[PDB]
Symmetry: C5
Subunit: 310 residues, 5 copies
């Protein structure tokens, strides 16, 4: 029974985040729990405060026509309880539900761990026999409690794109809204647990530049190479497989390269010094001691600029 109309029906939406949680990097999903609030004019429900009863009447959902509002990107239909439906004298219906869903929104891992993400909640409504278009009432979209926390992320803002995207799908009009939760990863913990140990085992690796023993050098460089393989695995398992190159994906690969030519060096110095050519072996190692750290820091400046400063 949609309200009989001379024009497009505006349903006013707002979302108030109550709890936010389980951001899944591999899955690129997050779970949300909130108030969805809808409001629309059905004048067939209009009344007189004095002549009709009291100020607002409440109906349960089976009474009224309610628009079917679905979230566009969600694994399953949201789980919702209807909190209230209240009709105002002029025919204004105010609906409030409390819902929970896990949303599917893509993530950009290019600056990971140093990445910020903008999560989307898309609302659509589909027209039949009268047009529906969604729009946002900003006073009920303000959207967060001060206790809302998303673990391991700082929550920057929750807002909505006010103009909907109206389009045709299978010979009917659909109206879509984009709600945006922007967040920034807390990169802190990555430093003691990942970045710094990586660095230590690399530096320890090239400690072999002040040594002449082939077996101690092989032992060093391959030990440290092992731990770097473990860190690459540790990191890679908690990330999805991207078509593109992440920032620490880049530095981790770069590191593989430094390990390779460090092994080339130790091998070459050893060969030279069983060739009775210790002058040239020694001059290579003397050089590496400067070359390796410097080219590392240069490559890292270049890399960092490439990912962040461009």
């Amino acid at each position: 029974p949609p309200p009989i109309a001379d024009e497009p029906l505006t349903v006013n939406t707002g979302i108030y985040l109550i709890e936010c949680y389980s951001l899944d990097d591999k899955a690129e999903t997050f779970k949300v729990n909130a108030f969805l609030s809808l409001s629309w004019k059905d004048r067939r429900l209009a009344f007189d405060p004095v002549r009709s009863g009291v100020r607002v009447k409440t109906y349960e959902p089976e009474a009224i026509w309610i628009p079917e509002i679905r979230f566009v990107n969600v694994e399953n239909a949201r789980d919702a309880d209807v909190v209230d439906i209240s009709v105002s004298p002029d025919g204004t219906v105010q609906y409030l539900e409390r819902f929970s869903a896990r949303v599917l929104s893509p993530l950009d891992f290019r600056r990971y761990p140093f990445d910020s993400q903008t999560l989307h909640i898309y609302l659509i409504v589909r027209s039949v026999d009268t047009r529906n278009i969604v729009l946002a009432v900003d006073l009920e979209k303000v959207g967060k409690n001060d206790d809302v926390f998303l673990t391991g992320w700082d929550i920057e803002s929750f807002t909505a794109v006010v103009k909907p995207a109206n389009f045709a799908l299978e010979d009917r009009l659909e109206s879509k809204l984009d709600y945006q939760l922007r967040i920034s990863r807390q990169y802190f913990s990555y430093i003691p647990n990942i970045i710094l140990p990586m660095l230590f085992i690399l530096f320890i690796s090239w400690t072999a530049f002040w040594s002449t023993s082939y077996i101690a050098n092989v032992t060093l460089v391959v030990s440290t190479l092992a731990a770097h393989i473990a860190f690459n695995i540790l990191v890679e398992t908690n990330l999805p497989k991207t078509p593109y190159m992440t920032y620490t994906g880049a530095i981790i690969f770069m590191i593989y390269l430094f390990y390779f030519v460090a092994v080339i060096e130790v091998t070459v110095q050893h060969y030279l010094k069983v060739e009775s050519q210790p002058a040239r072996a020694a001059s290579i190692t003397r050089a590496s001691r400067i070359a390796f750290p410097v080219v590392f820091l240069l490559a890292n400046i270049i890399l960092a600029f490439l990912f962040f400063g461009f």
Copy 2:
């Protein structure tokens, strides 16, 4: 109460993909979210545009006879919300639901990670008292939304096989339709994370051909063997166990052989060179320095041709 009929009821089908997600290589399952669209003529519902009310009349599912449409490959029956049901005057019914399922479709791992897959969604309907045959009207089959993304995969196309498979099952005829989602894996991230590190440690393995010390060579070759074991484990656990040989399964196995024969060699060189026979020790080691890369690259050309070019 089926529509009483003069011959088979054609149910016209379509699927419009909204979301795709959770492609599970081990499970060989993927999760889909879509519009299922059915239309059929039940003339008992035919009516009067002028005499009765409005142009098109709408029903809820409890009123009308609906055909029972099942998916063949699914863990469970779909979770569906009925979006709308609309009947036209001549008795044409248009049914629209939004469903979610995890589909069970087999995958071919032979060219993995460079593999391409065709996922299937099967619709069957079972007849009673008159035959039902499902068929596809392409305008509601057009499938993909343009933002459908399957993480770590490129979605190349979504189409439907127009001719249904009509056959006999338990003394009634069933009609089955095959919808096909073709996709290709994104192999990129495999290169920095698996292939290149694998190659690097194999090369580091061969650095022992320019050394004469048994212990540094053993240390080298068994260390790199260790990391290669780790890679074959990492790779193998994220894959199902196939009756056939996968491409990177082949290259990984081959790598095992190069490790073994490398060990045989270092062992042999050391033995010869404690046998007071450095002429043949040195000549073996020198030979291997050319032999191993050459045979590796030849084996890889042979293999790549074997898997892809065949």
Copy 3:
């Protein structure tokens, strides 16, 4: 309202496998999706083709008395949707449902990975006021679609044990039927990924018989020992804890022993050859070179006979 009867009621059962999947070795459970088909005579529903309507009458489940058929081994009650109910003029009811459950059946790992299993689906019905006995209609019993696949398994047959097992449970007579799905693991993939690498690292361990270097030998034997521990873990974690000895559990253990006495040997040779007693050390090692492969191949002949050929 059970059919009032002059005799114990035969419910004819049958199962048609549509989907098979998720065989979980650790849990010893597998998931199935199929047709359950029932037929029984309720004469109260009997009617006349000529005077009564025409040939077959259809009911909803709430119309008819339906027998409660439960699966004996299932974690939870199955999820079933009723496909059809058809009554024939004489009072024969033909019921058809589509269900999905995870069946819980024990597995025999003695010959793992080279092993066959017989999976069971048990149906009971519980009698009241009239006896129920279940039995199978063999032609509504053809079990499979030609598209059923169980990952990592070859499906040999799906049949039903024709004579039911009738017994008393909680002071009433219950009737049980045994449906049997026999399967054999595809051992292929175990060979390149587990078995052969295990062997290689064992042989690599034995190169220490051609070396007199204590440290290169200790390095060898403990390195490969490490890899064998890793393989033991890889295999055993994907298995349940059996009260008995699995086949590859045995060979993995046997391998542990060969590693131990290899360490003993390496130890004894080094000790003998630092006491200036190299003659007997050398002849020990010489012997080992023959003994270890000989006793390995023998122990394995013994074991393989013991598990499979006995």
Copy 4:
């Protein structure tokens, strides 16, 4: 509408275990599938065999008053299908359901892997308008199926404590019954997969007492220590964190000590023999060769006695 009562209603309870499964040591939960049977006198339901119908008639659950029987230690309320309800002419009601739940009962890990547990299923009933008390009818509590199995566990018995604990909770009387499933871990597989390898790498560790080589000793003792850490990890991840000390927790911890002072020995001997003090170095090592196995074996006697023999 409870049965009109001149006294407390005794509901007679019984449970028949059908399937048992998923004992989770970490969670301390197990999953059960069984018959719950209740019986009580509701005289309001009394009737005349001759005047009324037949001997006994059947109800669906909302016709009759049924007691609300809940499991006390359980994650969520059970999933139950009501199998039958039968009222006897005198007003005796016999209720039967088949339920499935995961039960939460604590486990005692002190003698693990050699530990036995008693799993509990607790029933409460809560009074209104007349007191309800649960009590146990042993003839329908009788056993499990004889095919009931709990993986990697031997099932000792299933019995019930006949006297209930009737007590006050939130100003009404609740009656609680304790059903006890006694079980014993099957420790077998722990011996080939955990105990024996642990020992082997420990002995291999002590092989360094017959060596004077500093580096072969460090390589030995440190390699084996690595594998022991791997075992400690493997074991501890499948167990919950106890405020107390387990048996293999003790054994593993002890082993750490033996590795440590083994390292101390190796270090002290090398130091002594670069002090040109080989007399006492050799005498230390010579002693260790006896002391380590002896103090180990006696410490194990002490430990075993301390945990098990009390």
Copy 5:
């Protein structure tokens, strides 16, 4: 349709914890099973004990108006069974349900494993047309059974904050109540499994100060470095990623630093002693032997004070 009122409707609340379980550190959620008890005056229900039946009358929830009481920090709506509804003649309703939910409360990992937590359960009710204020009756709040246990945690208390926080949300008043479960972690098992082994491998690492062999020293220090990397991973994977520094995260990091300068030292000793400057190379190593344990103990006092002593 709430009870018609001249003032705010007070719903009196209480929670009695029955089972507690699944505290999840990374998710920062825990699962609870309890009694929710609500009581309020709805006078429309008032009655005469004598004319109608008995003293107190019972309803099913669908008859009466019940307040919608929601939990604030919870993932999905709780699963609830209504245990009892009892109306007193004056119109006082006493409602009792048994619920289970996973609550989402933040955790403070700063002193981990030595950390204490206060978990929160928040109840809101939302006003319409009459104010609702939740408040708590202490007698049905007693909250624990003497058997409530949370694995790996000791439970200090369960209480509720008596004053509700009444505030305005979306132009209706909401009343919120704070129940507090205080728990403290059981750190015991962390000592044998994590802390002490970490310490052993660090000490074993420092044995390299009593040795002059470069290769035995790098073998020592990098082996132990490996095992410590493994401990850091073992710990980090069972913890969430905090914006701050945890206590054992701090000591783990500090340990990394000690490994780094141990490597620097070992490297420097070797370099000086191939530079023919053994006097103070040796005197450096002599110093390290005291310095490292002393600075370790001072850094640990400093750190421990810093975390716990404030």
